[PDB]
């Protein structure tokens, strides 16, 4: 199916990013490693990242989002993973504040 196929592909890709983000063997021989490593090296070096429309970083922040939802790794070296977790904490802070606001409106004036 086209559904199972996309999912497979995304999960193979995230698995390869997780590998390549921490791989320190120039002697590594996983076929995907070399290309993913480069994309990861590039992000370390790219200052503008997505705010500046860099097309590589724009693609791996979308990949990291698929990854970060599940990631439990505290010092995760996948590019943008920490950012996506920050963004999620902040959505929750804001949600709590919406809940406070609801109670406050009820008592207001
Ligand atoms: Zn490797
Ligand atoms: Zn970039
Ligand atoms: Zn992560």
UniProtKB/Swiss-Prot annotation:
It comes from the Eukaryota. A zinc finger (TAZ-type) spans 3-84. Transmembrane segments: none annotated. Acetylated on Lys at up to 17 positions by intermolecular autocatalysis. Sumoylated; sumoylation in the transcriptional repression domain (CRD1) mediates transcriptional repression. Desumoylated by SENP3 through the removal of SUMO2 and SUMO3. It is found in: Cytoplasm; Nucleus; Chromosome. The modification Phosphoserine is found at residue 1. The CRD1 domain (cell cycle regulatory domain 1) mediates transcriptional repression of a subset of p300 responsive genes; it can be de-repressed by CDKN1A/p21WAF1 at least at some promoters. It contains sumoylation and acetylation sites and the same lysine residues may be targeted for the respective modifications. It is proposed that deacetylation by SIRT1 allows sumoylation leading to suppressed activity. Functions as a histone acetyltransferase and regulates transcription via chromatin remodeling. Acetylates all four core histones in nucleosomes. Histone acetylation gives an epigenetic tag for transcriptional activation. Mediates acetylation of histone H3 at 'Lys-122' (H3K122ac), a modification that localizes at the surface of the histone octamer and stimulates transcription, possibly by promoting nucleosome instability. Mediates acetylation of histone H3 at 'Lys-18' and 'Lys-27' (H3K18ac and H3K27ac, respectively). (Microbial infection) In case of HIV-1 infection, it is recruited by the viral protein Tat. Regulates Tat's transactivating activity and may help inducing chromatin remodeling of proviral genes. Binds to and may be involved in the transforming capacity of the adenovirus E1A protein. It is linked to Defects in EP300 may play a role in epithelial cancer. Chromosomal aberrations involving EP300 may be a cause of acute myeloid leukemias. Translocation t(8;22)(p11;q13) with KAT6A. Interacts with HIF1A; the interaction is stimulated in response to hypoxia and inhibited by CITED2. Probably part of a complex with HIF1A and CREBBP. Interacts (via N-terminus) with TFAP2A (via N-terminus); the interaction requires CITED2. Interacts (via CH1 domain) with CITED2 (via C-terminus). Interacts with CITED1 (unphosphorylated form preferentially and via C-terminus). Interacts with ESR1; the interaction is estrogen-dependent and enhanced by CITED1. Interacts with HIPK2. (Microbial infection) Interacts with human adenovirus 5 E1A protein; this interaction stimulates the acetylation of RB1 by recruiting EP300 and RB1 into a multimeric-protein complex. This is Histone acetyltransferase p300.
């Amino acid at each position: 199916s086209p559904g199972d196929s996309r999912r497979l592909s995304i999960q193979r890709a995230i698995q390869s990013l997780v590998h390549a983000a921490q791989c320190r063997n120039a002697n590594c021989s996983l076929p995907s490693c070399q290309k993913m490593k480069r994309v990861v090296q590039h992000t370390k070096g790219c200052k503008r990242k997505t705010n500046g429309g860099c097309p590589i970083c724009k693609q791996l922040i979308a990949l990291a989002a698929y990854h970060a939802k599940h990631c439990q790794e505290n010092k995760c070296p996948v590019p943008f993973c920490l950012n996506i977790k920050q963004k999620l904490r902040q959505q929750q802070l804001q949600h709590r504040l919406q809940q406070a606001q609801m109670l406050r409106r009820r008592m207001a004036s």
